[PDB]
Design a protein around this nucleic acid. Structure first.
Ligand SMILES: [K+]
Ligand SMILES: [K+]
Ligand SMILES: [K+]
Ligand SMILES: [K+]
Ligand SMILES: [K+]
Ligand SMILES: [K+]
Ligand SMILES: [K+]
Ligand SMILES: [K+]
Ligand SMILES: [K+]
Ligand SMILES: [K+]
Ligand SMILES: [K+]
Ligand SMILES: [K+]
Ligand SMILES: [K+]
Ligand SMILES: [K+]
Ligand SMILES: [Mg+2]
Ligand SMILES: [Mg+2]
Ligand SMILES: [Mg+2]
Ligand SMILES: [Mg+2]
Ligand SMILES: [Mg+2]
Ligand SMILES: [Mg+2]
Ligand SMILES: [Mg+2]
Ligand SMILES: [Mg+2]
Ligand SMILES: [Mg+2]
Ligand SMILES: [Mg+2]
Ligand SMILES: [Mg+2]
Ligand SMILES: [Mg+2]
Ligand SMILES: [Mg+2]
Ligand SMILES: [Mg+2]
Ligand SMILES: [Mg+2]
Ligand SMILES: [Mg+2]
Ligand SMILES: [Mg+2]
Ligand SMILES: [Mg+2]
Ligand SMILES: [Mg+2]
Ligand SMILES: [Mg+2]
Ligand SMILES: [Mg+2]
Ligand SMILES: [Mg+2]
Ligand SMILES: [Mg+2]
Ligand SMILES: [Mg+2]
Ligand SMILES: [Mg+2]
Ligand SMILES: [Mg+2]
Ligand SMILES: [Mg+2]
Ligand SMILES: [Mg+2]
Ligand SMILES: [Mg+2]
Ligand SMILES: [Mg+2]
Ligand SMILES: [Mg+2]
Ligand SMILES: [Mg+2]
Ligand SMILES: [Mg+2]
Ligand SMILES: [Mg+2]
Ligand SMILES: [Mg+2]
Ligand SMILES: [Mg+2]
Ligand SMILES: [Mg+2]
Ligand SMILES: [Mg+2]
Ligand SMILES: [Mg+2]
Ligand SMILES: [Mg+2]
Ligand SMILES: [Mg+2]
Ligand code: NA
Ligand code: NA
Ligand code: NA
Ligand code: NA
Ligand code: NA
Ligand code: NA
Ligand code: NA
Ligand code: NA
Ligand code: NA
Ligand code: NA
Ligand code: NA
Ligand code: NA
Lengths: 57, 153, 198
RNA sequence: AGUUCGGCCAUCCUACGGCGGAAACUCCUUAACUCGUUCCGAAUUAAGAAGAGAAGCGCCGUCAGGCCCCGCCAGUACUGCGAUCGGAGACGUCGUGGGAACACGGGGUGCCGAACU
RNA sequence: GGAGGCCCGCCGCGGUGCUGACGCGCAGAUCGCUCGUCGGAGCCGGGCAUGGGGGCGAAAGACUCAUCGAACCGCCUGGUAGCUGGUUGCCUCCGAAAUGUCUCCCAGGACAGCCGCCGCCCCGCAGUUGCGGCCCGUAGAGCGCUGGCCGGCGGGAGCGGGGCCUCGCCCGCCCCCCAAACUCCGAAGGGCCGCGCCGCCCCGCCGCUGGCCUGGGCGGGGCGGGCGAAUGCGGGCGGCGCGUGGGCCCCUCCUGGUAAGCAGGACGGGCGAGGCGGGACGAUCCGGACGCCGGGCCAGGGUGCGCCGCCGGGGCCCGCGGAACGGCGUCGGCCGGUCCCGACAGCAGCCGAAUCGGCCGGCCCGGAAAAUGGAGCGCGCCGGAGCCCCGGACCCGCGCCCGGCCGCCGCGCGCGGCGGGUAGGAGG
RNA sequence: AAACACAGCGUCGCGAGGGCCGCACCCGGCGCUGGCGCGACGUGAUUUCUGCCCAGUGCCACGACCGUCACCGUGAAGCGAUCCGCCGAAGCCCUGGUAAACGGCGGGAGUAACUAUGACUCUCUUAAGGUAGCCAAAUGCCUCGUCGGGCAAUUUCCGACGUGCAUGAAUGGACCAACGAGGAUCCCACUGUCCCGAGCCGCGCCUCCGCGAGCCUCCAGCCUCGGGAACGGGCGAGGGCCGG
RNA sequence: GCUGGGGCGGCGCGCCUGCUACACCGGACCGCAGGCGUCCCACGGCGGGCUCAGCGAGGACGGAGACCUCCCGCGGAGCAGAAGGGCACAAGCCCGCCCGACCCGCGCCCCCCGUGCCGGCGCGGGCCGCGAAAGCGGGGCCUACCGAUCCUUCGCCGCCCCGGCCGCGGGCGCGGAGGUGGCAGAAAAGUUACCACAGGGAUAACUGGCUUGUGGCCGCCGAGCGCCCGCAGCGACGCGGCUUUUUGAUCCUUCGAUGUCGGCUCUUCCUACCGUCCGCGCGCACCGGCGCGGAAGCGUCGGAUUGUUCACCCGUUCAAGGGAUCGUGAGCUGGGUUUAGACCGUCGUGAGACAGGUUAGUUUUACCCUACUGGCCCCGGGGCCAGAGCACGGCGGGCCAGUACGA
């Protein structure tokens, strides 16, 4: 008793049913895989800037 | 059979072009890249480190990471009914800068220049919008015509 | 006969399947001679040419090719002498056909080699004949005799060219009366105008 | 004009003839020292200045091979969409869009940049 | 004289054959003929003994109260079942999947996809074209590379056959034909990205980077300018949960097979889960996708009569599924000859104008065969009621338009749009 | 029934403090027995016979203790739990016996004054290479083997033949008088088995008086072709048909 | 376990290359041609130097090849093993020094549910190798070469043994090794012809349907045969069709059952015609034969052996082929096939097996609807006719005549 092995017949219609979802607008600015030396320098420059430092007083 | 090794079905896309074998020219190493720049992906088959998968050949993306020897490129990939953002590391032999924005940059520059020019002289500003080809206008042509006929079989 | 009827392999249904390192145990074709008559004959003699064209897209077995060769050659040789014509078979049997011999039915039914056929398109010449004015009175009857061994529908034509060359008779004769022809054992070519001198 | 260092990597390559050197480059001379050759100062390392355009190099030529551009090939081959169009089939046709290749003919045969003489 | 697991034969004890009767029986095993044995390892009655994975067996897995390859009674026990059957009122709003991965998985499940309900937030969108950048090696083409394959003609250093000669191997040119696992070339077709903020000046921070007063990144402050393709149109996110996981058909493109209403794949559509008209007749073909009604217009298909609806004009003309191959059936062509200087058919005489050969096309004829009597739907028609073409009409699917009413969703609260549905979900 | 039993034949174990079996325990049977006995197996009257193989598996050694193989015991070390040695019953291993134990029992070449065959030679090879017999058998694939008998004519039957797919010696071989509701072939006699059917008797059936059920049941009950889950009563098109 | 039924066979049951695949990606088959479960302290890292295969010519104990020299040499060599890519002052060959074939911690790509596993890549620190230096180095140029929880064993540094302390011992946090190839990973031999259970037309064996390879029948062509003479009769090498009376292929309907071979009996139908009828042809004198067209009315038999269909033989008035659920079991029969008893041979340790042989083995129900055969539901005597049915074929003898014809 053999049954079907494979079909992609209806798959493109199912994909378009609710549109093709775009990624989130925060995935474009993640620090997920950035060079660590660059990230460390960015942190220290912000903290020492009086106009953008969040340190209290 | 059906096996899906990392480099399956690459007999033609990874081969070198005709009479373009050997080492790459040195311009591929001393050009400057910046964060946010658009680049193209083209695999070079003579360089086996930092090589992307066959799927990414012929796609365009932006730079998110500048490394000591490799770049980080963001690419949009469709998977079923959804788009995923993929981040890959590529060596310099497989990446070229992209001219997908050059037309827009030149249009912006020209628009600003023309806006400046007419203001100083006060001339009216023309239309700075692209037009899709409009139908032709009225005109007059001369006749020195040649009779055309259908030939025998 | 021991062979399937020719209707089982009439049409071009598969991709070309030549004999190579992948296909090995192939029997020898039935036809081995493709040039008959007076092959050695200067282009000067034998001015008239006839073609048996193909009006079908199909496959022709090597047995049919052998039969047609024998029939046409025998007739023309008997009627007008063995040295008045040159006959060329213009198609070769490069395609291999398979058989699934009949336990297991459709399971594992890939099939073994059996024979060879030629693949021909519409309008493609199948035979060509060169002759002088002596045998031109029977060339067409030889072609009609060979027409009955080939599947389908064929047409007989008389070419306007000179023999097997690419020149029309008018152009050939002019270029001969203007001294612009390099001559070979069968064919003629225009004189060269490029390369070094001397 | 030359040399050093480069960019693009044959319109720059290959073969065969010819022309040229003031300066430059080159070929050239020597083996104490330095370093060197499965053996060899051939190569390479060091030290020179009697010779030379004979090569390399720069330029010219060839009904030259190659490489490059334009035409023709040809709206042909093939093809997207529509057709109760023809045909037993194999295949073809019409409407509406896109559109080659080989072959052949004509012409061409390195520029660009920074420093010194 | 009278022995014998001797012989014929009655009652008894058995149970051969008719494969007889009966087979809703007289009967949950009987009846009739025929048959085996009949002093013996014979037959019959009563009492007693052996008990369930046990007994008993001249052995057939036989018998053990109509029950035996493991009795019967009650209880554990309403034992378990991915498997078969059934599962009870109405209306309204939405509405699938037959696919991917894993599974002692393949008649089942989990996770993902598709769908319903419940929400929440306020941040421009698109199964489209145009313009700009980049990617691919398929059809075709070809023989330069990797392979394959007919011959012709020239040169001979070297080598062989044969008679310093004559053909061969080798070198050159020319030439026939080729490739899913060949490619110097290469479409149609596809894919990805972009199409508003820009320009100038100055200032701050860095523990990164540079020979430096270099860079890069992140911020602040002033000046000028501005919304720079078309078309359409509001967008995004979360929670909980069901069904489904045997599919099939059409178009175009493929693979195995002689082929198949065969088996296996691909873009788009359909049936499933789509009413209605037509195709005589059909789940899928041609049109058209549905609340209840009145009127109008008309798609697809047709208009002798059954059976709603037709005429006019031009041409052809013996209607089975069907091939190679034949035809002097008729109509229409193309290319060649001969001909009043007399052709063709019966050099000259007789006549007195067309004729001869080849290659086709349209509609026909032959090739053309099966089993109950029968199907261009039937009856029939046939200078049509057949075939091809041109023109003007007609018939009818509430499909489309106009008007009335019902419900749902919206709303400048005046009105506007819409209405199919299996499995499944929700409201009254 | 050709199956089982059977007389006969053969093998094996046991001398009582034993053997075989029952059985939860206590206790039992053979056994009121004692080798001319009891128990366990195979073959299956008579006649004539019963060949070779102990490599495999099985069984047996009042054979041997080689190696291995327990607890216990004992020695050393340790704070102790422990650990390391020695010691070494049966069994296996080792050495022998046993086929009326289970079972098994060969290939290729050459060769004699016509041909043909092969008494004979060579060669590989086993634990041993199927002996006496028997056979197209209830056992032979090819096969309806070949020859003979019997018939007008025989895939049946009988007699021979034999490199026998895959016969064979108490898993018994060969033969056999008497016996058999056993399987098979032929001859005489006899006949409705048949050519080829005919006539008759009784009971049922059938009609009547009395009595009086079961099974089954979507609905219904005439055909041909088409299409359709590919063989329709219903559907499309035709042809027929009062009702009971 | 998969599986064009199951079994036997095979292993697309974990992975890799090229093709199938129709120019992004993806894409099936017990599709095609193949490969893997390894090998190497150098066959690894780095630096330097060099250029390979080979053509041509020359050197000669020396030859079709040893070794030497020059020339030109785009790779035609080599780089561990499949195939496809890549590589020339190199990724190849030779030489020198070395061990980055290291330690700590993160992220990404491929397959994909965007989970795991194998494999790869990019980084931040530590310590190193080579090189003048810039640089390069986490193995063998790239695409394959491998493995969870629980348990055991080993290694560094520490923590716990809960009334305390000390010494042994046990446990715990991190990382390796011991293995699951059916590779997301149970610990597992047969047989049932004494047999079951739940289901299945999701799936075989018998009818029917599509197909027609095979079987059967028929055309076209004309190399030849036929004393000579292609076609009286034949007809090679080839090519085109038809049929469903053979056998295959497939799995659409039927497993809450359509009684599965042959014979006997009885009816009807086909034609692709064997005898008889009517024509024509012959290599047709007569007799007898052979070929073709129309034609399905009648005929196509009795026996021996076999269950047989078939086959084979004897005989005769000389003896075609088929269909109808492979017509016909509430018509029979029961020889065969195909339950349960029993035997032989071969096979198996055995229970048992055998498209090998042999013998013995219950064949149930019509009263219902229709169809069919007859018969009824009264009406005078004698006739006619629509419609329906339908029935004379074959073989001899006598005369013609021992004639025509023929030696
Ligand atoms: K019991
Ligand atoms: K599954
Ligand atoms: K080539
Ligand atoms: K006995
Ligand atoms: K022994
Ligand atoms: K035997
Ligand atoms: K005889
Ligand atoms: K008996
Ligand atoms: K199947
Ligand atoms: K049995
Ligand atoms: K049947
Ligand atoms: K035919
Ligand atoms: K059934
Ligand atoms: K029967
Ligand atoms: Mg499935
Ligand atoms: Mg045939
Ligand atoms: Mg195929
Ligand atoms: Mg007595
Ligand atoms: Mg007696
Ligand atoms: Mg009876
Ligand atoms: Mg009865
Ligand atoms: Mg007991
Ligand atoms: Mg809806
Ligand atoms: Mg498992
Ligand atoms: Mg092609
Ligand atoms: Mg299911
Ligand atoms: Mg199908
Ligand atoms: Mg359904
Ligand atoms: Mg639908
Ligand atoms: Mg009407
Ligand atoms: Mg609705
Ligand atoms: Mg419902
Ligand atoms: Mg013997
Ligand atoms: Mg025998
Ligand atoms: Mg005998
Ligand atoms: Mg016998
Ligand atoms: Mg007899
Ligand atoms: Mg034996
Ligand atoms: Mg014996
Ligand atoms: Mg025996
Ligand atoms: Mg019915
Ligand atoms: Mg009806
Ligand atoms: Mg299975
Ligand atoms: Mg998998
Ligand atoms: Mg190097
Ligand atoms: Mg580091
Ligand atoms: Mg698994
Ligand atoms: Mg029935
Ligand atoms: Mg029944
Ligand atoms: Mg006929
Ligand atoms: Mg019946
Ligand atoms: Mg029987
Ligand atoms: Mg039996
Ligand atoms: Mg009646
Ligand atoms: Mg009548
Ligand atoms: Na007696
Ligand atoms: Na039994
Ligand atoms: Na119960
Ligand atoms: Na309809
Ligand atoms: Na006795
Ligand atoms: Na045995
Ligand atoms: Na891997
Ligand atoms: Na089925
Ligand atoms: Na049949
Ligand atoms: Na039957
Ligand atoms: Na019956
Ligand atoms: Na009655």
């Amino acid at each position: 008793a053999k049954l079907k092995n494979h079909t992609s017949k209806n798959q493109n219609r199912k994909d378009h049913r609710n549109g093709i979802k775009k990624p989130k607008k925060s995935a474009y600015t993640s620090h997920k895989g950035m060079c660590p030396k660059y990230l460390r320098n960015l942190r220290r420059s912000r903290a020492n800037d009086p106009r953008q430092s969040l340190r209290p007083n | 059979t059906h096996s899906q090794g990392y480099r399956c079905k690459t007999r033609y896309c990874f081969a070198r072009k005709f009479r373009r074998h050997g080492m790459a020219n040195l311009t591929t190493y001393n050009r400057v890249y910046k964060l946010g720049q658009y680049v193209n992906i083209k695999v070079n088959g003579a360089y086996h480190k930092g090589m992307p998968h066959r799927y990414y050949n012929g796609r365009t993306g932006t730079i998110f990471n500048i490394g000591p020897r490799a770049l980080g490129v963001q690419i949009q990939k469709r998977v079923r009914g959804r788009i995923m953002l993929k981040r890959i590391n590529v060596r310099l032999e497989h990446v070229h800068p992209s001219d997908c924005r050059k037309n827009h940059l030149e249009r912006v520059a020209a628009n600003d220049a023309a806006r400046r020019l007419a203001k100083e002289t006060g001339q009216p500003v023309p239309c700075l919008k692209r037009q899709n080809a409009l139908p032709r206008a009225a005109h007059v042509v001369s006749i020195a015509s040649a009779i055309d006929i259908t030939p025998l079989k | 006969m021991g062979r399937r009827p020719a209707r089982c392999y009439r049409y071009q249904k598969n991709k070309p399947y030549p004999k190579s390192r992948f296909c090995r145990g192939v029997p020898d074709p039935k036809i081995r001679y493709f040039d008959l008559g007076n092959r050695r004959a200067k282009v000067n003699d034998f001015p008239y040419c006839f073609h048996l064209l193909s009006g079908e897209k199909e496959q022709v077995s090597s047995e049919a090719l052998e039969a047609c060769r024998i029939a046409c050659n025998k007739y023309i040789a008997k009627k007008a002498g063995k040295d008045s014509f040159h006959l060329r078979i213009r198609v070769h049997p490069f395609h291999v056909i398979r058989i699934n011999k009949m336990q297991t039915g459709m399971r594992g039914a890939w099939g073994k080699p059996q024979g060879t056929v030629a693949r021909v398109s519409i309008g493609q010449p199948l035979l060509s004949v060169r002759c002088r004015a002596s045998a031109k009175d029977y060339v067409k009857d030889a072609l009609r005799r060979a027409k009955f061994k080939i599947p389908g529908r064929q047409a007989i034509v008389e070419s306007r060219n000179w023999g097997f060359t690419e020149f029309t008779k008018e152009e050939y004769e002019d270029l001969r009366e203007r001294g612009e022809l390099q001559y070979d054992g069968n064919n003629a070519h225009r004189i060269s105008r490029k390369g070094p001198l001397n």
